[PDB]
């Protein structure tokens, strides 16, 4: 009976932060560079005309 307060009311959700999208992440940047190469290869797979 020292305290009637709730020590753990709930846990704050961590589902979404504010900012830091991690799309500027350098290896994400490298992947976005590589998908461009893949799209270009698919484009050159089409007939030349």
């Amino acid at each position: 009976k020292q305290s009637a307060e709730v020590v753990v009311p709930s846990f704050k959700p961590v589902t979404s932060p504010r900012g830091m999208d991690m799309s500027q992440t350098p290896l994400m940047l490298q992947a976005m560079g590589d998908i461009a190469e893949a799209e270009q290869e698919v484009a050159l797979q089409k007939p030349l005309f």
Partner: protein, 162 residues
């Protein structure tokens, strides 16, 4: 917890939207990085003991008072708990890198760690120094791009502790 896929799913679920071209591009980018992530995770898993040994060696070389009598890492219990915390940080950094998302770092590492350490008298700056030494050791083992990626999660831990 969240990974990159789940993060895109959640941002398109809050809006009640089906996936657009932008979401498919984000999913493609993650699927492209997946091979590098798995390679780095396997390398770190094979070398965890080496990383902990080297990082704790630098930490205790720079902060010898931590292992001199009376220091926070002075007893076999407290030394073992120190290297166990370093192993925890390495494991959860590897999880986070494999997920591509730092939510696990907040949920399963940073939550209450600061006042855990403050209630135990664990020095937080020396823990951050240990994390930086761990980052330096890991970068040499996983290669340049994986080193840059792994530094993000190590720096997330360091900033959350600081």
């Amino acid at each position: 917890m969240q990974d990159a896929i789940t993060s895109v799913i959640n941002t398109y679920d809050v809006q009640g939207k089906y996936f657009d071209t932008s979401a498919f591009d984000k999913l493609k980018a993650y699927y492209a990085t997946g091979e590098l992530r798995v390679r780095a995770a396997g390398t770190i898993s094979a070398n965890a003991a080496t990383i902990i040994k080297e990082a704790s060696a630098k930490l205790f070389s720079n902060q010898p008072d931590l292992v001199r009598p009376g220091g926070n890492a002075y007893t076999t219990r407290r030394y073992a708990a120190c290297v166990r915390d370093m192993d925890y940080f390495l494991r959860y950094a590897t999880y986070a890198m494999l997920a591509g998302d730092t939510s696990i770092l907040d949920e399963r590492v940073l939550n209450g760690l600061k006042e855990t350490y403050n209630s135990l008298g664990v020095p937080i700056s020396s823990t951050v120094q240990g994390i930086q030494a761990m980052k330096e050791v890991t970068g040499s083992l996983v290669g340049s791009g994986a080193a840059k990626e792994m530094g993000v999660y190590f720096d997330y831990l360091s900033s959350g502790l600081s």
